Amino acid sequence: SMLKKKQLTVLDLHPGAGKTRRVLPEIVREAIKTRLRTVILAPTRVVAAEMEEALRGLPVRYMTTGTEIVDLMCHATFTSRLLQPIRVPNYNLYIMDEAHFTDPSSIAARGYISTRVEMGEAAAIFMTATPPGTRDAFPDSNSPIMDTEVEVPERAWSSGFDWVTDHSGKTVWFVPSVRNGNEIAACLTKAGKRVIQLSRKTFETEFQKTKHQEWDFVVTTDISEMGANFKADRVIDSRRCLKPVILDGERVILAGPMPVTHASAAQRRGRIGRNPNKPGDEYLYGGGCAETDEDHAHWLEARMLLDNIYLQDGLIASLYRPEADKVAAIEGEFKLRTEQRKTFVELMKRGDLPVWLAYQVASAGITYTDRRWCFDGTTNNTIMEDSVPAEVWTRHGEKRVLKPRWMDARVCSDHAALKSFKEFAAGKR
Ligand SMILES: Nc1ncnc2c1ncn2[C@@H]1O[C@H](COP(=O)(O)OP(=O)(O)OP(=O)(O)O)[C@@H](O)[C@H]1O
Ligand SMILES: [Mn+2]
């Protein structure tokens, strides 16, 4: 149709308008009719699976871990394939759903895609109700939403918030961190509620439980802003988030809790008011928003990824321009030689290390299986487990205090992350 190359379109209908399950299949059917080599990009594998069914019997290859011109994969999968030697089709049409996702792989993907549009080699469609720079925390909905500013608990409580537990419906509660969510969920559970906790690490297995089991509360991080569907009538929003910040170019901290963006607030609010024959959904929020970023590490990490993706001779892809000033970096300053790039990739995939940390280790000429850097840092880089120095048994047979040469707070911000990094340090993966 007008997928006739040459162009980037931002489909920005209000939340719940039918972008993912009404408009998306229409575009795919058009793309197949016009025989365009197309890729579909979902934010998560959970959402990718729900797209399988909305794309009823259409020739779509699902690269989710014949005459097949149309691919479906998640944001991170797409970006991950671009970094590897493994061949990626120069698609004629790029479709990114939930294109507001601010994770490094999603930022990198938007940059790569938009760059391909500018070069005149492809068309692109970014689907999101909240494009970069939106200041509207209260967009349109299918049904009226009762918006109420309240004092939202960020700690366990024994009194003062009756309205929280005095609610017979189902509530989605956005928290700024996993650990904060743990405390709130434990309080709700003790008060007799059934609670499901969602985070980025647990999402792909815990989200499916929000359907096939009963629940009163979902306590979730900002991961549920990316196309997550709940049968709920209430959203409690702390309006808080944590921001990864690179300090003095030498370490990453998790600053906050801190005001979420208008986009995030709109996406959080947008979890309800979706049912057209159902008014009464409430959005209860505990504070204001802010354009917080620009020292947000994710956009620098996105640059690290994009610098190591090849398009054609000497060419480095630009960030999607509405996002391009979110970071102070020179394009190509993180480009690694091919051997270092390989280590960089493995550290992110098999190593499951944050992009920033993986770059530090790889650019220092360290091989993937060399874990000495996990112990030879300054003593202020010491990682604590419950107010006591965390220790692992090394591959060489010593009990060493975990003390990484480069400190990234994301490797120990909760128990699951610490367990994973402790295992990485012991050379177990
Ligand atoms: N298979 C389906 N087809 C069409 N509509 C559906 C389907 N399943 C659920 N719906 C409902 O129809 C509405 C359309 O939802 P959809 O996810 O397409 O909106 P959206 O524009 O993607 O929202 P957002 O921008 O917040 O992701 C929702 O309120 C949803 O609850
Ligand atoms: Mn959607």
Numbering used by the authors: 182 to 246, 254 to 617
Provide the authors' own sentences about this structure as they appear in the paper.
The P-loop, which is critical for NTP binding and catalysis, has a variety of structural conformations among flavivirus apo-helicases. In the ZIKV helicase180–617-ATP-Mn2+ tertiary structure, ATP/Mn2+ are located at the cleft between Domain I and II. Substrate binding causes an inward reorientation of side-chain of K200 to stabilize the triphosphate moiety of ATP and a flipping of the side-chain of R202 towards the solvent to leave room for sugar moiety. The 3′-OH group of the ribose forms hydrogen bonds with the carbonyl oxygen of R462 and the side chain amide group of N330. The ribose group of ATP bulges out from the binding pocket and no clear electron densities are observed for the adenine group, suggesting that the ZIKV helicase may not have nucleotide specificity for its NTPase activity.
The NS3 protein plays an essential role in viral polypeptide processing and genomic replication, with a protease domain at its N-terminus and a helicase domain at the C-terminus. Upon RNA binding, the helicase domain exhibits intrinsic nucleoside triphosphatase activity, which then provides the chemical energy to unwind viral RNA replication intermediates to facilitate replication of the viral genome together with RNA-dependent RNA polymerase (NS5).
